[PDB]
Amino acid sequence: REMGTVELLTREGEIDIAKRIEDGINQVQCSVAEYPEAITYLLEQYDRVE
């Protein structure tokens, strides 16, 4: 019953949801790249690798 309360998608809905996911991921990526501590941790990890 709980599963059938919802209706399946189509190709257009799948494309729209994928686009929304990509947009959210891009926004999160921009927000986390806008900080310098990310670059600091990247450099520290690269130094540890080297």
Question: Closest distance between DNA and the C-beta of residue 9, in Å?
Answer: 7
Question: Closest distance between DNA and the C-beta of residue 1, in Å?
Answer: 8
Site size with DNA, rule: CB under 7 A: 3
| Cα 28 versus chain centre, distance | 6
| Cα 27 versus chain centre, distance | 8
Count of CB atoms within 10 A of residue 2's CB?
5
Scan residues 1-20 and list those touching DNA (CB under 7 A). Answer: 3-4, 8
Interface contacts to DNA, rule CB under 7 A: 3-4, 8
